[PDB]
Write a protein that binds this ligand. Structure first.
Ligand SMILES: C=CC1=C(C)/C(=C/c2[nH]c(Cc3[nH]c(/C=C4\NC(=O)C(C)=C4C=C)c(C)c3CCC(=O)O)c(CCC(=O)O)c2C)NC1=O
Ligand SMILES: *[C@@H]1O[C@H](CO)[C@@H](O[C@@H]2O[C@H](CO)[C@@H](O)[C@H](O)[C@H]2NC(C)=O)[C@H](O)[C@H]1NC(C)=O
Ligand SMILES: CCCCC/C=C\C/C=C/CCCCCCCC(=O)O
Ligand SMILES: *[C@@H]1O[C@H](CO)[C@@H](O)[C@H](O)[C@H]1NC(C)=O
Ligand SMILES: *[C@@H]1O[C@H](CO)[C@@H](O)[C@H](O)[C@H]1NC(C)=O
Ligand SMILES: *[C@@H]1O[C@H](CO)[C@@H](O)[C@H](O)[C@H]1NC(C)=O
Ligand SMILES: *[C@@H]1O[C@H](CO)[C@@H](O)[C@H](O)[C@H]1NC(C)=O
Ligand SMILES: *[C@@H]1O[C@H](CO)[C@@H](O)[C@H](O)[C@H]1NC(C)=O
Ligand SMILES: *[C@@H]1O[C@H](CO)[C@@H](O)[C@H](O)[C@H]1NC(C)=O
Ligand SMILES: *[C@@H]1O[C@H](CO)[C@@H](O)[C@H](O)[C@H]1NC(C)=O
Ligand SMILES: *[C@@H]1O[C@H](CO)[C@@H](O)[C@H](O)[C@H]1NC(C)=O
Ligand SMILES: *[C@@H]1O[C@H](CO)[C@@H](O)[C@H](O)[C@H]1NC(C)=O
Lengths: 48, 96, 48, 325, 124, 283, 48, 48, 48
């Protein structure tokens, strides 16, 4: 809240979206986990 | 596999989900009959027994619009669910 | 569903028969599609 | 289908909808006629700063005897149609009577401004009931002035709805304290109306009576002049219970209402159970339309014979259009 | 000047023309206003912000819950009750659940690779 | 007529908790086996209510308390001590005041311009020669003019004999003044606790709706003391108090989720937006 | 030939019009009568 | 700030209806997009 | 979103809680479906 109140003289998209009750949830799996899964698949398909 | 199916009863949730969704949609459609939709009451009998048919038509029009909106929303939900169930059935037929 | 067991509201509602007919047509199509789905899935073989 | 030709198949029609047989009316049996002469034909009315409130009960609200005399110049009703006043029962009727000036009669209405609507008498925003006002120049006015009616002019803040303020304390307009004396910037709040027979139309006394009541939510004692009818059961009939009109089947009940409850409601917020005003018993109300109907027919260019499938019913008469064979 | 509302007034940087009094947003709502008493511009900001999520086991097991406040650090703040067991994730501040170092097949998805469960006394 | 009491010993005020207490029927409509959501003035769950008590050890509490949108008033007693209420704005014969008194013979409700003195109370006397407790002192007001409302109930006799032991009767009231209507809800319960409010649930049924039309901002409680030959004081030192307690709380606009059972009686309620779990239950 | 007058620099009280000058007609469009003490007006013209 | 709560409820009711219509339209669009993205994800899983 | 930071409109809107709850349920289902889609696509193998 201290950041969206900071840029009151400059227009923003996310601040206007959030002030009207429209929020975005974060994904359960982060990009590091997906990279780990892909690396495991590569290792499996190369070695075995 | 016989023993596992006999013991547990939480592996067939993919069908109970569909049954519960259909029942809950019908129950919600029943629930939405208590909304005033901006009128003075949610019952036609009170409006008909309290006002004459020169100022009672406004509330009835509002109620009709609200009920029609509810029915259209229910129909759209059913259409989307039918599409996804049809896709699942096509996959099952291919597997068979 | 809208105003069952009422006469005046039926006269008022007579101007939404197209909407009601379209809803009923959609539901009938849904039911026919489900029956066709079951028949297509389970009747691959013809001789019992 | 909006056509004269129908293809071969099966179609769905309206459910088995059954028409009512007769109509009944059940009102509480009260014989007395509550006073229309102690409210409209009284000899002395209270002032507007202290208006008179009277509770009325055990009525047969006819108001057809008010046609011989007492023509009303203003009769405006909110929350109910004037033509439905003979088909309703009222819970608790309160009559608020006072006398004002004619030009001020327009201030007796929800959401209005003026000295009457601010310092003397205020109506709530959600008002059910109505206002009657009539000229009484030949009764409340006499030659040489009539200073028997008073009204308030100065007040710190506006009034709340249905609030009475009769205190007579010195009002301070400026900054110096008054301490119970009339002087400079220290006025007396109440002042008397001046009524004479030679005044204009605006400056003439008007008597105002405001009736307040509630509808179709609690046991009702004041009722209209409609007659009663015998009670029938196990048939789809039209019923009128204390002004609540509907169609359905009345059946014996098992629920026990509290002594202050009259109607029962369903999850869909619709009337389900009702207590008979004549004899204290509970009855359940059930719609008499039930059961789907389907029609099986070949093409209309082949034959006109059809078959009818009635859902959710045995056949082993019943609820069918025609038994046939 | 008759315009009533609720919000937070903050010093502004916009310069109004001598014939302008109110400023409006893209959603057609009041954003900036000039003070009638002393001629200065102030911005109006709503004071409601930030999502809230509740993590709970079955009500037939326990009544303890955890609260996740989105888009806020915890490293008081805009929370219902600080309490203890404050944990910081990339999905928000979690209050009511202690942090451990093990890793199992997670039970309740919180987000950003963080999950929660009801374990052992008894806690979340 | 009324006198001033100069024997009380003052202590800091005491506070207690309102355990899911203070739920009343919102309407006069019969519902059975229904989860019903309502939006009205209720006492918040787990509220920090004020405790007053009358004991001899001496404590005799009857101060002037504010009236904020409605009052929830509970009373635990065994000898019928708490027996009146006074509502008003200034209580100084300049504004109308409402008086509700049970004087062991009648229940008098009067909207009237009273002149209340500093210490209003009622007084019972005990006779040694024969076993008979009788009410004898009535010192509430001194004058009354412009007296609008009137209500006197049928005569009756109340058991006002001195009884000790354990608290027995719990009486709960909810008062609210809206649009010129003073609405009172009441409920009575038998209990066997000694000190505080029992933990449980009880629905309050509508009792009365008075069309008074008064600006009400303050109120006061009317208790009853005992006069005995043990203390030889004349009027201000010869008074001995009984044993009773009453708890006061204030109402706020809230959303509640009530549960109507099969028989049609409220059995449980959820104070919504109390804690986020309650909000989840609401949703 | 009706008279038009511009009014400015006011404290619009209209509570002094209660001592005399009872108005037989007072009808207001665009604003509620009860909100006249919570508003500020831009340019008031009186046509008499 | 301009009307009392006896004639201001009409405009608020209209605004509520419009906002609800907008929200329902957005939800329907999101549902359709979710269905098509789910089909694409199923194809990707089969390919993997 | 509809009339945030307002009290009277909330009281008026209390008659649309079923609609709001249904919209929120649809959105929650969408989010859960997306998480399930990602998990099903990328977690075919179990051993890293
Ligand atoms: C204060 C005047 C007063 C009030 C506000 C109230 C409610 C009330 N209490 C009672 C029984 C009944 N009611 C009371 C008295 C009370 N409950 C109280 O809050 C108080 C103050 C008393 C009097 C001390 C007693 C001592 C008993 C004897 C059995 C019982 O505990 O219910 C009734 C029904 C009597 C009948 O129908 O024959 C009512 C309407 N009752 C009153 O007398
Ligand atoms: C009801 O009574 C209260 C208290 O007497 C009134 O509030 C007072 O109003 C005057 C106006 O000048 C103020 O000086 C006081 O400070 C106020 N006291 C309090 C506690 O608020 C109130 O105006 C009355 N309500 C009505 C509708 O008349
Ligand atoms: C002549 C200067 C007035 C200019 C003010 C303009 C707009 C503000 C409004 C005042 C409302 C109308 C004034 C008279 C009200 C009549 C009140 C009554 O007695 O019923
Ligand atoms: C009149 O009312 C009473 C209810 O007190 C009832 O017992 C009686 O039967 C009624 N008379 C008739 C003819 O119904
Ligand atoms: C009112 O009173 C007059 C005489 O007192 C009488 O002639 C008239 O009939 C009465 N009208 C009604 C409705 O009672
Ligand atoms: C009155 O108005 C003037 C603006 O011209 C301002 O400078 C002054 O501060 C105001 N007086 C007070 C007490 O605010
Ligand atoms: C909290 O603010 C700090 C910067 O001071 C930053 O490191 C951090 O990213 C913020 N919290 C989260 C979860 O991002
Ligand atoms: C009681 O005290 C008040 C003020 O302290 C006083 O006005 C009153 O006269 C006193 N009454 C008696 C009997 O002392
Ligand atoms: C709550 O009750 C306690 C008594 O221990 C008291 O000290 C405190 O002031 C009360 N809190 C409030 C907000 O009144
Ligand atoms: C005996 O009891 C009566 C009332 O019960 C009482 O008036 C009287 O005082 C008692 N007798 C004597 C002699 O006091
Ligand atoms: C109130 O009583 C006083 C004197 O007793 C009297 O002057 C006044 O007229 C009365 N006011 C009302 C409204 O009765
Ligand atoms: C309802 O009332 C009856 C008394 O006839 C009682 O037997 C029954 O236990 C009650 N039902 C419940 C759930 O308490």
């Amino acid at each position: 809240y201290g950041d969206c109140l900071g840029d009151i003289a400059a227009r923003d998209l996310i601040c206007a979206q959030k002030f009207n009750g429209l929020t975005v949830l974060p994904p359960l799996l982060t990009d590091e986990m997906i990279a780990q899964y892909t690396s495991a698949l590569l290792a499996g398909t190369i070695t075995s | 596999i016989q023993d596992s199916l006999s013991s547990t009863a939480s592996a067939l949730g993919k069908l109970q989900d569909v049954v519960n969704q259909n029942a809950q949609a019908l129950n919600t459609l029943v629930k939405q009959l208590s909304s005033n939709f901006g009128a003075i009451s949610s019952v036609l009998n009170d409006i008909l027994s309290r006002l004459d048919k020169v100022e009672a038509e406004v509330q009835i029009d509002r109620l009709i619009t609200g009920r029609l909106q509810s029915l259209q929303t229910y129909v759209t939900q059913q259409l989307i669910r039918a599409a996804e169930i049809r896709a699942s059935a096509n996959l099952a037929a291919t597997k068979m | 569903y809208i105003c069952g067991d009422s006469t005046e509201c039926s006269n008022l509602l007579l101007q939404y028969g197209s909407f009601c007919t379209q809803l009923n047509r959609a539901l009938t199509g849904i039911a026919v599609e489900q029956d066709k789905n079951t028949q297509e899935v389970f009747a691959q073989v013809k001789q019992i | 289908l909006k056509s004269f030709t129908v293809e071969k198949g099966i179609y769905q029609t309206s459910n088995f909808r059954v028409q009512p047989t007769e109509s009944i009316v059940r009102f509480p049996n009260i014989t007395n006629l509550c006073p229309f002469g102690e409210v409209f034909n009284a000899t002395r009315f209270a002032s507007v700063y202290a208006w008179n409130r009277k509770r009325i009960s055990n009525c047969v609200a006819d108001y057809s005897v008010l046609y011989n005399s007492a023509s009303f110049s203003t009769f405006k009703c909110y929350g109910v149609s004037p033509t439905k006043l003979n088909d309703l029962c009222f819970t608790n009727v309160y009559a608020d009577s006072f006398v004002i000036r004619g030009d001020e009669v327009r201030q007796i209405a929800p959401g209005q401004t003026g000295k009457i609507a601010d310092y003397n008498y205020k109506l709530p925003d959600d008002f059910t009931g109505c206002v009657i006002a009539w000229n009484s120049n030949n009764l409340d006015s006499k030659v040489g002035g009539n200073y028997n009616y008073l009204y308030r002019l100065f007040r710190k803040s506006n009034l709340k709805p249905f609030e009475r303020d009769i205190s007579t304390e010195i009002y301070q307009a400026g900054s110096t304290p008054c301490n119970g004396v009339e002087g400079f910037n220290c006025y007396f709040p109440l002042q008397s109306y001046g009524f004479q027979p030679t005044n204009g139309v605006g400056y003439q006394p008007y008597r105002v009576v405001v009736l307040s009541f509630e509808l179709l939510h609690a046991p009702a004692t004041v009722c209209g002049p409609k007659k009663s009818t015998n009670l029938v059961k196990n048939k789809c009939v039209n019923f009128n219970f204390n002004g609540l009109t509907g169609t359905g089947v009345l059946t014996e009940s098992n629920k026990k209402f509290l002594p202050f409850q009259q109607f029962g409601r369903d999850i869909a917020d619709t009337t389900d159970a009702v207590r008979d005003p004549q004899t204290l018993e509970i009855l359940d109300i059930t719609p008499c339309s039930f059961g789907g109907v389907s029609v099986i027919t070949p093409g209309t260019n082949t034959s006109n014979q059809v078959a009818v499938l009635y859902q959710d019913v045995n056949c082993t008469t019943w609820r069918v259009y025609s038994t046939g064979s | 000047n008759g315009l009533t509302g609720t919000g937070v007034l903050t010093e502004s940087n916009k310069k109004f023309l001598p014939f302008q009094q109110f400023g409006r947003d893209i959603a057609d709502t009041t954003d900036a206003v000039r003070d009638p008493q002393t001629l200065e511009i102030l911005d109006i900001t709503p004071c409601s912000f930030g999502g809230v999520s509740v993590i709970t086991p079955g009500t037939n097991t326990s009544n303890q819950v955890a609260v996740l406040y989105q888009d806020v650090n915890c490293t008081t703040w805009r929370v219902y009750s600080t309490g203890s067991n404050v944990f910081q994730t990339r999905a928000g501040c979690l209050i009511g659940a202690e942090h451990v170092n093990n890793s199992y097949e997670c039970d309740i998805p919180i987000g950003a690779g963080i999950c929660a469960s009801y374990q052992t006394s008894q806690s979340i | 007529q009324c006198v001033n009491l100069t024997t009380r010993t003052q202590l800091p005020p005491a506070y207690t908790n309102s355990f899911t207490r203070g739920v009343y029927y919102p309407d006069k409509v019969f519902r059975s086996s229904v989860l019903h959501s309502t939006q009205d003035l209720f006492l918040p769950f787990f509220s920090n209510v004020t405790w007053f008590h009358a004991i001899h050890v001496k404590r005799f509490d009857n101060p002037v308390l504010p009236f904020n949108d409605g009052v929830y008033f509970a009373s635990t007693e065994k000898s019928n001590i708490i027996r009146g209420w006074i509502f008003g704005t200034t209580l100084d014969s300049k504004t109308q005041s409402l008086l509700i008194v049970n004087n062991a013979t009648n229940v008098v409700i009067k909207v009237c311009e009273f002149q209340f003195c500093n210490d209003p109370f009622l007084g019972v006397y005990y006779h040694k020669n024969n076993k008979s407790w009788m009410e004898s002192e009535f010192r509430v007001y001194s004058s009354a003019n412009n007296c609008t409302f009137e209500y006197v109930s049928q005569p009756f006799l109340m058991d006002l004999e001195g009884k000790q032991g354990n608290f027995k009767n719990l009486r709960e009231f909810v008062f609210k003044n809206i649009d010129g209507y003073f609405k009172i809800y009441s409920k009575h319960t038998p209990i066997n606790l000694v000190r505080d409010l029992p933990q449980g649930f009880s629905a309050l049924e509508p009792l009365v709706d008075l069309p008074i039309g008064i600006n009400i901002t303050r109120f006061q409680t009317l208790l009853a003391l005992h006069r005995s030959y043990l203390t030889p004081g004349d009027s201000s030192s010869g008074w001995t108090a009984g044993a009773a307690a009453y708890y006061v709380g204030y109402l706020q606009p809230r959303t509640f989720l009530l549960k109507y059972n099969e028989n049609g009686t409220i059995t449980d309620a959820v104070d919504c937006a109390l804690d986020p779990l309650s909000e989840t239950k609401c949703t």
